[PDB]
Amino acid sequence: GLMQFTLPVRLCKEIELFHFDIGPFENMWPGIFVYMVHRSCGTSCFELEKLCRFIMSVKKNYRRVPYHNWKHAVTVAHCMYAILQNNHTLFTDLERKGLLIACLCHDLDHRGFSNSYLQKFDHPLAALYSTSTMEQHHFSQTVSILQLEGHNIFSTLSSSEYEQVLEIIRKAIIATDLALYFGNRKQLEEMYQTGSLNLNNQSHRDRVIGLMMTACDLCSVTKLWPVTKLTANDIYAEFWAEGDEMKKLGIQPIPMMDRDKKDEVPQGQLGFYNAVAIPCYTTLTQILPPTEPLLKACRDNLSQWEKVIRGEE
Ligand SMILES: O=C(NCc1cccs1)c1ccc2nccnc2c1
Ligand SMILES: [Mg+2]
Ligand SMILES: [Zn+2]
């Protein structure tokens, strides 16, 4: 009960900021996550024996892939933490619980390949789940880990609260499918401008939670430039592995994924910030004004990519 986690001073201050980097010390990340659940949720939300056992089993089931790894899990959980702490009264006790667990679990057992590559490979997961293949898998893996003896961190919830928390986590993990972002954001942009957006309307909250999930998932573009630039490397390490695996199926991959076409990366990053990142954080700032720093940092990184193109770095 009286056992808090404390970070060193600098982490303790920086962790409250959207652009916080969780750092290179793997052994500190579970502590960081627990610190965030205790501050976001309460010391009371989870039995700490079970939370620790849940965290270390989730970590075990992330793979040693360049980007879609444990560090990404905790980085995405941190971004959700910054949004929840900056919007303290807009979210239920159940949503703050569910959403940080959703983020930590959102890419469980990722192999570093797009849904498109699973479909073209004809992977068994593609037979089992026709759309949002990896994301239906990540939710399935979360439910598997929650069911291990000693891991049900939600055990103290009523029957109905339990079903609600697993529904929040399912929708939240499905929403990380970028293919669903475009429709979701458009619907949110219309609802906001026509003035019909209503946070007491569940269908509306669901959509807003989807946007948050996309925003947290992409939060690499919202870091200080050296973090953004060095994370892009890991992201492209995966894209190029997949491009290589496409060429092994006798399919020329899209330029983004072709390691032969590295030159085109800066322009591809511009399109990504323009088509995806900026619209995402713009719409999110409109619905949740206190998330303006994510839109600001993203605009800043777009400009850095423009400078890279103009040969200035
Ligand atoms: O998923 C990416 N590109 C393919 C698609 C975009 C939209 C729908 S499918 C992508 C591209 C570039 C990134 N740079 C940074 C972070 N995340 C990134 C993610
Ligand atoms: Mg994912
Ligand atoms: Zn992710």
Which domains, and CATH codes, for the chain? Answer: 28-310 (1.10.1300.10)
| Residue listed under structure tokens 């690499």 | 220
**How far apart, in Å, are the Cα atoms of 149 and each of 51, 60, 127, 170, 257?**
12, 16, 30, 21, 41
- Going 188 to 191 to 192 to 198, the CA torsion angle's sign is negative
Query: In sequence order, which residues have a C-beta less than 8 Å from that of residue 311 and are 6 or more positions away?
Result: none
Is 234 annotated in a binding site? The answer is no
Instruction: Please state the three-class secondary structure of the chain as a single string.
Output: CCCCCCCCHHHHHHCCCCCCCCCCCHHHHHHHHHHHHHHHCCCCCCCHHHHHHHHHHHHHCCCCCCCCCHHHHHHHHHHHHHHHHCCCCCCCHHHHHHHHHHHHHCCCCCCCCCHHHHHHHCCHHHHHCCCCHHHHHHHHHHHHHHHCCCCCCCCCCCHHHHHHHHHHHHHHHHHCCHHHHHHHHHHHHHHHHCCCCCCCCHHHHHHHHHHHHHHHHCHHHHCCHHHHHHHHHHHHHHHHHHHHHHHHCCCCCCHHHCHHHHHHHHHHHHHHHHHHHHHHHHHHHHHCHHHHHHHHHHHHHHHHHHHHHCCCC
Resolution (A): 2.2
- Residue 198 structure tokens: 């209503």
Q: Which ligand is nearest to the CA of 177?
A: 2
Distance CA 227, CA 18 (A): 13
Distance CA 3, CA 6 (A): 10
Q: If you measure from the C-alpha of residue 16 to the centroid of ligand 3, how many angstroms do you get, rounded to a whole number?
A: 21
- For ligand 3, a single-atom ion, the residues with CB < 5 A are 107, 217
49, 115 in Cβ contact below 8 A?
Answer: no
Radius of gyration (C-alpha) of the chain in whole angstroms: 19
Q: If you measure from the C-alpha of residue 75 to the centroid of ligand 2, how many angstroms do you get, rounded to a whole number?
A: 13
Name the residue at shortest CA distance from atom 16 of ligand 1. 218
Query: In sequence order, which residues have a C-beta less than 8 Å from that of residue 45 and are 6 or more positions away?
Result: 37, 38, 93, 96, 97
89, 29 in Cβ contact below 8 A?
Answer: no
Q: If you measure from the C-alpha of residue 73 to the centroid of ligand 3, how many angstroms do you get, rounded to a whole number?
A: 7
- For ligand 2, a single-atom ion, the residues with CB < 5 A are 107, 176
Amino acid letter for position 17: L
Q: Is 68 a catalytic residue?
A: yes
Name the residue at shortest CA distance from atom 2 of ligand 1. 272
**Residues enclosing ligand 1, CB less than 6 A?**
178, 218, 220-221, 232, 235, 272, 276
What dihedral angle (degrees, nearest 10) is formed by the CA atoms of 148, 33, 141, 179? 160
**How far apart, in Å, are the Cα atoms of 254 and each of 37, 81, 239, 265, 269?**
40, 34, 10, 12, 14
CA-nearest of 31, 29, 39, 81 to 294 is 81
Distance CA 133, CA 279 (A): 25
Query: Which one of 272, 281, 305 would you pick to mutate in the ligand 1 pocket, going by the greatest count of ligand atoms within 8 A of its CB?
Result: 272
Is 269 annotated in a binding site? The answer is yes
Name the residue at shortest CA distance from atom 1 of ligand 1. 178
197, 204 in Cβ contact below 8 A?
Answer: yes
- Residue 61 structure tokens: 């089931």
CA-nearest of 46, 44, 42, 40 to 90 is 40
